[PDB]
Amino acid sequence: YPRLEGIIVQINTGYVASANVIRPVSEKRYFPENLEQNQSAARLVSAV
């Protein structure tokens, strides 16, 4: 039964999701202030 990996990960996911260890947020900070709208870094912000 090679679906048993789907069981053991599902048990281990239930420990992580109950530990309240990582919570998302709706704010992006991939770039510092005034670098996204900079024309010189347009080749870099289109890859990130």
Partner: protein, 67 residues
């Protein structure tokens, strides 16, 4: 590009809408050129007019006159 034979007063809803993306915003400006289906030559016309329309003036204060 876009249907010339008369007064063609400056409203031009390609040109003002494309500049409000070009001036403040543009890294997206690859994406709405194929929303025009602007060809590579047609793309070259508009960009030279956007870069010259960056001396003057503001998108934030609207005014319209006709030539």
């Amino acid at each position: 590009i876009r249907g010339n034979y008369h007064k063609f007063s400056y409203d031009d809803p390609v040109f003002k809408q494309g500049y409000k993306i070009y001036k403040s915003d543009a890294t997206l400006l690859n994406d709405f050129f194929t929303a025009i289906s602007a060809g590579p030559k047609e793309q070259g016309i508009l960009l030279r007019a956007f870069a010259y329309y960056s001396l003057y003036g503001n998108v934030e204060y609207h005014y319209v006159l006709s030539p």
